[PDB]
Amino acid sequence: DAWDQDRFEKNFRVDVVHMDENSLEFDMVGIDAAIANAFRRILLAEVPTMAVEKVLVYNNTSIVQDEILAHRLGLIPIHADPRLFEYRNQGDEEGTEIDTLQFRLQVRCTRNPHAAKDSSDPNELYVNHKVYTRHMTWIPLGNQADLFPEGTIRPVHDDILIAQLRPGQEIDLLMHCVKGIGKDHAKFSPVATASYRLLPDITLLEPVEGEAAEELSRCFSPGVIEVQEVQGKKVARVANPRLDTFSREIFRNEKLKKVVRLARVRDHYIFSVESTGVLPPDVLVSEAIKVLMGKCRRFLDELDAVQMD
Amino acid sequence: KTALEMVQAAGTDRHCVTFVLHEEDHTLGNSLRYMIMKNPEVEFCGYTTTHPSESKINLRIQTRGTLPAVEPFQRGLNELMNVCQHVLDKFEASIKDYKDQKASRNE
């Protein structure tokens, strides 16, 4: 059958289940797997973010090395909005206001004079012995102090254990954030994991009663089959088939693999978009829908530039 | 510098052409393949990635009934843009109807 656009603008609906900070779970009823997988695969690898690319060390006298520290810094989510920034043009190590950010992680560790008699708890003995990500001074360059408020360019979490120091031991580095997508390197991905699942339908082909309904209620995940009394017998009915983890434990039971028809519902996906905090999950999904459109715009522009006639 | 090549069947046949879409993968070519196969003037629409070390897709569009294969390709691009614009609209109108019940319920 052909593509009736008013059959898609009549049987498509997004039902948001739960949305909070750094998480989202919604439906997409009436969409096939080839567009749903496109949205999933643009959330994971094509929606761009900002992340640390170059590290400029001086006196890393720490046990965490000069290399593993740089890789560990690159995997830190930076809370700059990607859309304000451009791709850094190639072969340009020094950056400008448009392309790069800069931070600075300068932490010395020195012995604590006070509150240290006959103890061994390490917080009482040393100052600056856990280099956390709240130690990153944002060094603004060019004119970025006016575009962004005081305290927006920022690491997302501020509780990430970068290194662990001892007295004498120092970290003095400088960073350069760049823009990239989650296909160049996976430190640029803005999503924890974005994934979909079909909606299950569990159909009782036969009325279950009595001692088999409590057996049926434990073969599924807790929440699916409720067992409530209807005139002396304990009948069972389905209730939230969304909760079912689809573990097929009822097909291990011989008496009750003939009273359920466990299958799925076609084109009734349940997404789940968990952000790493760089962008909220309702702007990641919109900027995942708006990249598939740009991939479709660029090729129509190429065909317009190829044919003149 | 361009990012679409068209490779004819014999230099004369314009029904079969294998579009070489540079800098794509199965994100676009699985959803283009879904839209162009919804066109009844297409005998055959399938795609393959050339080799996973490379970064392009081959897209065979093979049209019956005397059409060039640029028209099912353009119709399947606009007809996917018109899916995504509508999905964007019904998604930005259900996030808003969720924020307007999280807030305006007891606060």
């Binding site: 289940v17 779970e25 919604f26 439906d27 939230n240 969304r242 079912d244 349940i270 | 969720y98 019940q101």
Partner: peptide, 8 residues
Amino acid sequence: GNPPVTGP
């Protein structure tokens, strides 16, 4: 797998 609050 909570039931959706923005339903039919």
